[PDB]
Each structure stands twice: as C-alpha cells, then as structure tokens.
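Dear U.,

Please find below the material for section 3 of the report. The protein was modelled together with zinc ion; I have listed the sequence and SMILES used, followed by the predicted complex structure.
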Amino acid sequence: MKVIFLKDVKGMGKKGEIKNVADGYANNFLFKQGLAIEATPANLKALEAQKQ
Ligand SMILES: [Cl-]
Ligand SMILES: [Cl-]
Ligand SMILES: [Cl-]
Ligand SMILES: [Cl-]
Ligand SMILES: [Zn+2]
Ligand SMILES: [Zn+2]
Ligand SMILES: [Zn+2]
C-alpha cells in the first residue's frame, strides 16, 4: 500500500512523504488513526488542489 502521511509518525514517515507499507498496517493503524491516506493519483490530485 502506497500512503501519503498527514501527520508525522516517528520512525515511519513525515507529513507529506510517500511510502509503501504493509497493507495490514495501513488499514489497521495508519488510516484508522488518521495518520495517512492512500497515495492514489486521485487522492494526490485532491490534496494538491486543497493546499493551493
Ligand atoms: Cl502491500
Ligand atoms: Cl515534521
Ligand atoms: Cl516536524
Ligand atoms: Cl502488517
Ligand atoms: Zn499493499
Ligand atoms: Zn512535523
Ligand atoms: Zn499485519
């Protein structure tokens, strides 16, 4: 699973970084805790638009 971090997770990734991680971790921890979202082209396009 490719994710973009929304918050800093020490030892894992900083806000704005894009990293591939185990699906279980993404689904059960990162997404569950609101720390990241999937880095799909669609999500990235939407995130860029809001920042601008
Ligand atoms: Cl995977
Ligand atoms: Cl930071
Ligand atoms: Cl920081
Ligand atoms: Cl896992
Ligand atoms: Zn995966
Ligand atoms: Zn930070
Ligand atoms: Zn697991």
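For the text of the report, you could mention the following: The pocket of zinc ion (ligand 6) is lined by residues 8, 14-15 (CB under 6 Å).

Regards,
Y.
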